[PDB]
Amino acid sequence: SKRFPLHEMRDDVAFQIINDELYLDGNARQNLATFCQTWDDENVHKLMDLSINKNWIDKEEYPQSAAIDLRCVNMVADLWHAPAPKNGQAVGTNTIGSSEACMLGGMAMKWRWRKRMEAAGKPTDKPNLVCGPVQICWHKFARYWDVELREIPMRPGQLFMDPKRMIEACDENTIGVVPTFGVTYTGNYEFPQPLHDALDKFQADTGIDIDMHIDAASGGFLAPFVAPDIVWDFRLPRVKSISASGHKFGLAPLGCGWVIWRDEEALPQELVFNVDYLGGQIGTFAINFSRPAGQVIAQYYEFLRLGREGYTKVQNASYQVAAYLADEIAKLGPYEFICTGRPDEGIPAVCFKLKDGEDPGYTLYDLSERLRLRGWQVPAFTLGGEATDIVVMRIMCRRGFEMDFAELLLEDYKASLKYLSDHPKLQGIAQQNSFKHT
Amino acid sequence: SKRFPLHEMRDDVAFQIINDELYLDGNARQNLATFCQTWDDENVHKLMDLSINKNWIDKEEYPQSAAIDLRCVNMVADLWHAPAPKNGQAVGTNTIGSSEACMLGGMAMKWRWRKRMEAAGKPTDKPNLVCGPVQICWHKFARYWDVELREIPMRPGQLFMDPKRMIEACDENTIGVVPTFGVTYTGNYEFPQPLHDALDKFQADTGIDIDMHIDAASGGFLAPFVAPDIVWDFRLPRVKSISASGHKFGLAPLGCGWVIWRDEEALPQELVFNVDYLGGQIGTFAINFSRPAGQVIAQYYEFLRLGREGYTKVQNASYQVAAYLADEIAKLGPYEFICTGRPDEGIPAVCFKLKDGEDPGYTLYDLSERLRLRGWQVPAFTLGGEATDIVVMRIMCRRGFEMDFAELLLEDYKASLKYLSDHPKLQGIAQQNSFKHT
Amino acid sequence: SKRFPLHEMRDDVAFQIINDELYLDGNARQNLATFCQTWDDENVHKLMDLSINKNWIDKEEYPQSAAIDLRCVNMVADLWHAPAPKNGQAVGTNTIGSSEACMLGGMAMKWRWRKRMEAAGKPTDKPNLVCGPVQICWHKFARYWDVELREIPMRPGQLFMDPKRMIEACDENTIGVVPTFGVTYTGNYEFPQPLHDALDKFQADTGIDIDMHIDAASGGFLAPFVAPDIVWDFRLPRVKSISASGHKFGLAPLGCGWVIWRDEEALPQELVFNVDYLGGQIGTFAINFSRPAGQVIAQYYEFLRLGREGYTKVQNASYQVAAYLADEIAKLGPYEFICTGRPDEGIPAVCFKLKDGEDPGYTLYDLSERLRLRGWQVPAFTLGGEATDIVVMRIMCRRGFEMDFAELLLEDYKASLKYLSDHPKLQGIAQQNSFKHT
Amino acid sequence: SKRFPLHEMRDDVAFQIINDELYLDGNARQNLATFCQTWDDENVHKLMDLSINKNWIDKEEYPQSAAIDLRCVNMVADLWHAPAPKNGQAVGTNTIGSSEACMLGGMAMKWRWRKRMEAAGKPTDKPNLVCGPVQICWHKFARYWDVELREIPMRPGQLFMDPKRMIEACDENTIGVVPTFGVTYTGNYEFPQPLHDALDKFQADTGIDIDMHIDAASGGFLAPFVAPDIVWDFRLPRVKSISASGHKFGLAPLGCGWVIWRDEEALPQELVFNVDYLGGQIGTFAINFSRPAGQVIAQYYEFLRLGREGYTKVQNASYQVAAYLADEIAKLGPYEFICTGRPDEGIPAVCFKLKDGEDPGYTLYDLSERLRLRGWQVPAFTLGGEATDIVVMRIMCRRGFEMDFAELLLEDYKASLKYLSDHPKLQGIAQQNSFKHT
Numbered sequence A, B, C, D: 001s002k003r004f005p006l007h008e009m010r011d012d013v014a015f016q017i018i019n020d021e022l023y024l025d026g027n028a029r030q031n032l033a034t035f036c037q038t039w040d041d042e043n044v045h046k047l048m049d050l051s052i053n054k055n056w057i058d059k060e061e062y063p064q065s066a067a068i069d070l071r072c073v074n075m076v077a078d079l080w081h082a083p084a085p086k087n088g089q090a091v092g093t094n095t096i097g098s099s100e101a102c103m104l105g106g107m108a109m110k111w112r113w114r115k116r117m118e119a120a121g122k123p124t125d126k127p128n129l130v131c132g133p134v135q136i137c138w139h140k141f142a143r144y145w146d147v148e149l150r151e152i153p154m155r156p157g158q159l160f161m162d163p164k165r166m167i168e169a170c171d172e173n174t175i176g177v178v179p180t181f182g183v184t185y186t187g188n189y190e191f192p193q194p195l196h197d198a199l200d201k202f203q204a205d206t207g208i209d210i211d212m213h214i215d216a217a218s219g220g221f222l223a224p225f226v227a228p229d230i231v232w233d234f235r236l237p238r239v240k241s242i243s244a245s246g247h248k249f250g251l252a253p254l255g256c257g258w259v260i261w262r263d264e265e266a267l268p269q270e271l272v273f274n275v276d277y278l279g280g281q282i283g284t285f286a287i288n289f290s291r292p293a294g295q296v297i298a299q300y301y302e303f304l305r306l307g308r309e310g311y312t313k314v315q316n317a318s319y320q321v322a323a324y325l326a327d328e329i330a331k332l333g334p335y336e337f338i339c340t341g342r343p344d345e346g347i348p349a350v351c352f353k354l355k356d357g358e359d360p361g362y363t364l365y366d367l368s369e370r371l372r373l374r375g376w377q378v379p380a381f382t383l384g385g386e387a388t389d390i391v392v393m394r395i396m397c398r399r400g401f402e403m404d405f406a407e408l409l410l411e412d413y414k415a416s417l418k419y420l421s422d423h424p425k426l427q428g429i430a431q432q433n434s435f436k437h438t
């Protein structure tokens, strides 16, 4: 049970035991809380099966996996408008996910800032990072790398880091600013452009030059296709690096993330380690070492098969569903929407709360429980900062969640409302927050 | 081939294109350089295929995957003699590999050390780490977390960190010592026991109490089965944590690593982050967030199917082949062996060099090249520290590399020698280090 | 939107669309309400796949499928102690399920009765059928064939047809008595032996000769293996026919039923239809005509693979889990058990209710809902007969639901109780019967 | 050796034994006697495999299977011009085949009649059913439900139920008329419109109001696509119900039938039974209960993939081949055709007999045997009624039977004729009817 087994067991019996237990896991098709891919593609399955033993770090034994990874780095860099590479190869790396990507970005950000302060003869004893309602990976970064996290707290009417409060927290100890292009909590984009203008003025008034790292975990694979006019990437001079989750809207299977740097200068060479290989040593900047290359290969398949044309069609379908749900749900209760699935505002999500004062006879926690009985997982949870007095419901519309599935959700939603009305004693009982990806 | 594709392509054409390219990767069956699993098991393939979308961090949607992970943690802790958990669950976590596991162990060391010094009213801005010929992940750890790496260099006579030099580098700023229970370069174990005795005396003399973290990337899944008497794990009081690679001798597919802590006190809770889940929040101490659970499930399959009984047989087979090759190769040239595949000395590997002042007409680099033309990748490389000019050949004997495969290698080895003798001009031409996992 | 589609679409697109929505169906591994097979066997999947086009009624084109069906009929007849047939072939047939099998048995009863009456110059326009708490297929039989259904009502302290009330309902117009060897509602066996004794005495006293048809939908593939001493089958003279569901404890996949007659005399030939075939016409007594032979083939696979000893082990495991749950659940509340998974009393099920006048702060309907939120479907429903006031919870233990899953259920059971205790306003809200197979 | 096996057997041995004997079944590709699907589609195989455990009656655990079934009901009703449903859902149900469907239609018909007679103060103990050369399922219906079958006999000139002889058999005890829209014996359609006009006149002259149930086992999925203007469905007032076989020209795998009622009024609610489900009770009118939902899912796949335009193409291909064979075979002997594969007269079949008084030196029975030696099963059999002295050959052209298969059949046909000519003693030897689906 708790001990390492003493004796053997027939291969097929062991497989039989485990296979039967796994049916206890959900298939997530009715899970509207997660951001990760849950759609099945036969080709992706075959590519992953073929790559179970392909070692991502062994560029000697698996040269083509390595080659494909480099093409991916170039493509993502291009998608984000990185300046043309002098050597023809963009500066970036594949990672397990946005978490590792963000940490690599954070470290580079801290290193640049440090070397800069040292060149000015200033102490590098107490660095700080300015950001909004960031995902937990940034809290780990601040803690693990001894950096003071200056999180602009959420607050009624302004659930994001705005220019004014951002500047209020910036000083010579700020290694950089991290806008979240697709806030986990709500689905809305923190727009880098306005923040960028503020940083320019800041330099003009104080001489302090601050860089940006965009945590585009979700938005990095959305805006480029459905809202190209939004300027949030390398088109902005201060953006030295950007990270995103391939396994979210990048459409790759779980285990794929990306981080790109503006140019060679943006990435401190002190953070790159050379590794010997027969064809010459190659530098790597990663937290991991041995790991499978299947997700990189699957990511490439998605790029090759879809292109901008196909990604636009896929993301457009998600936004269409999200907008549909936002419009229909609005008609069923006294709700105040925070996100409505608009391409120009954020990701394909619907986030709302009960209007202040309004009491329809149930909280969102109660509604979430009723829906769970219908098989749906629609997360309800309290926000942070100075808005912890707010309870919201967030619906994520991923690939595979078609219009007809949304129609069914609406029927169950209405059925859940009718039930809550018929049984008033239910109101107020549900009090636990669901998994919200952070 | 550099920019993100503009137009889409037929799914099957995209697959066909990538599939054809992948034949350029090797299958590693004749690669005797890598430590990672290269053997195919139909059941492992099925479990992995079933888990492509199972999110390791989403304990809510995939509860059984989470349950299986916890069983593995307990089993590994048991295998390493961890003290009985007061709450029934061992303290530890699954990782992508030994690199992440080592970083988590390192940070824990750094944190325990901190609170130790602060308590004793002493500064904490100049920490250092004492170790031997460690794998690159530790060099990354030192650089990324600003810790002074005090690596005891290899030298003709002792290519490992010995008790004497270890104490010489130890002081009040030593956050801990890291013995490598299975040195990447040679395959030999750095025995923790002697170093442990030295650490107790160091405390009895200076009052300084230094702990250890065992990097058992390879050895953690070897000694427990074929050399139980070697005391290197939690049986030693100073060992507060141990890490190992499941995808190496743990026999799991690429993407699995483990780190276990002696008990709750060994892991600073300041490094643990809580995440909300409908069934209550759960603490996680990891660098990654979203990622697939298939490797954990496959690891469990190996534990269940093999048990101590099955692992002993698998590892015994490897040691058998290693010892055989060591015995037969010694008869082919003037060699000095560093590792001969002995269960009591290290892992299933053969490592040797030409005897000092002995020129047989070829270097090990030349031999490696002849073998490469015969399909084998047997790495030749220079050591580090004060042995920088020593060239060695290291042969890894993994699951799948059976006796008849070793017999073929010997025939190719002898043929390579005859060719080198018949063509003296080849001597000294090859000079590049092969991939050596570090 | 729901009209017959106008245009064609790509084969793989249509499949993709349907495949994706099928995830909305459950996998039933945590459904403890159904009696049907939910376990998966690769060999069964292969046999079914190979038989997709094998026509059960076309004995000419698919002679081996026909041969296999006949072997199954002989094996089932043998299992139920049917008298040895003169021509070497038992009288009986495969069906889609117990429903069709019961109707065939019902028609035969009605026919034997009619002929009996006609021979004695008695009217045949007012036939009735005596039974206990039968599954809905008998209510369908009564209505479709105009037979007065005399169902002995369940009542506190006697939820089954007892000898006394059975006789009270019998007369000259009774076509037969249907004991239910495994009552759907509770899982308990209605023992034929005592009822048979009553029918013998009834004949001796009134001259009325009444026969039985045993509805052994579940019990037919249980008692023969774990309680062979229970005399419920053909060993009893009045039992003219027996039916059972191969897809329940017969372990066959959905779509397999069986009905066996005592001998040629038990099956009126007026009900058999001869169909022309090259090798000679063959009689058929069935409601269906064209249909696949896959389930018959799979049933045969189960017979050959397991045999008596195999089935005994499979059923024994289910009885263990059931007895275990009954034993453990009793310790968690003021319950009165109706069925506790004892082999000598019924099927592997647990059925209970709250003790009269006892109020633990919840109804079983509330507990069922809490368990649903934890992924389990454990049906709670009101009884039939004259007990539509009593609410019970029934747990079915099928193949695949092993001990460890039962342990998990207990953990969730206890967790549900605690939640109900900490939230008393939940009491009495839930009030809808779950699917209970009738 | 016919008993229930005693010991277990290795799963692989049991599978091997059975797999090897199944090769004794034919693959039916050269069987031109059957109406059922014998074509293989990988997507249908995948869908069926995924649905092995999906319980058609458990709408609670398998809600999507249930929802898909309802879509199919609506689509088939639309295809047959059923009046728009007030509640949005057509009245009808999936069945295992046309046999069950016909019995359901038959019972409903008997009930509607009974209600009418009771209100009229007339006896209801002598019901009769008027029909033509119906398939065996109606003979079963008549026997099982005690209804007098008034079958208009086949006779030279008219091998079907004509208006005049239909009316001559109709009286106040007639529960209805059953036209066969695709006669099993000949492939010819019995046109409902002419019969309908006759029933209109019958009511005008006698006040006796008689309805119809169309047995469109084969024609129900043909005429709507290739002969839209044939008025045989709900477009006709007296048509209260229609049934058809999905596994015949509906292109679904074995185990799928359909029966649709004109409206709620056409279906006596006393024949519907309610079943409890967590989401509310749902009524069912079926003979069977538990069974797999795979065929329903596969039928939906065919509807979605093909649509009206696709079915038209598939059906046209079969008719093209039928017409081709009819035209060619006529040039090979003194034959009188009954069916020539015309879309406006019937299904894709070829039916013929030897001209009266003509003796080419062989009977169709002899020709059939010769073709069997060449791998073809082309049934030859005697008709009934007043044509008991007429022997015909019927060739069915199903999906998969391409033009080149037909060309091969013709070569073998010619070869068989030559052989018969060279061996005159063969004439008259063969005298057994083949399987003809009835």
Ligand SMILES: *[C@H](*)c1c(COP(=O)(O)O)cnc(C)c1O
Pocket (backbone or CB within 6 Å): A035, A096, A097, A098, A099, A100, A134, A135, A137, A180, A182, A183, A184, A215, A217, A218, A245, A257, A437, B288, B289, B290, B291
């Ligand atoms: C999901 C998310 C992350 C974490 O990315 P992973 O791929 O899960 O490691 C980081 N930031 C934001 C804003 C996210 O939504």
Ligand SMILES: *[C@H](*)c1c(COP(=O)(O)O)cnc(C)c1O
Pocket (backbone or CB within 6 Å): A288, A289, A290, A291, B035, B096, B097, B098, B099, B100, B134, B135, B137, B180, B182, B183, B184, B215, B217, B218, B245, B257, B437
């Ligand atoms: C292989 C190795 C590592 C790195 O482990 P990964 O599983 O590749 O991350 C670390 N330390 C040693 C001693 C190793 O051999």
Ligand SMILES: *[C@H](*)c1c(COP(=O)(O)O)cnc(C)c1O
Pocket (backbone or CB within 6 Å): C035, C096, C097, C098, C099, C100, C134, C135, C137, C180, C182, C183, C184, C215, C217, C218, C245, C257, C437, D288, D289, D290, D291
């Ligand atoms: C399940 C059941 C039936 C119906 O059997 P099916 O195989 O679903 O047709 C009939 N009687 C009893 C007692 C049952 O439990």
Ligand SMILES: *[C@H](*)c1c(COP(=O)(O)O)cnc(C)c1O
Pocket (backbone or CB within 6 Å): C288, C289, C290, C291, D035, D096, D097, D098, D099, D100, D134, D135, D137, D180, D182, D183, D184, D215, D217, D218, D245, D257, D437
């Ligand atoms: C084939 C046929 C039937 C029987 O249909 P099944 O799907 O085999 O139950 C009934 N009537 C006619 C006219 C048929 O051709």
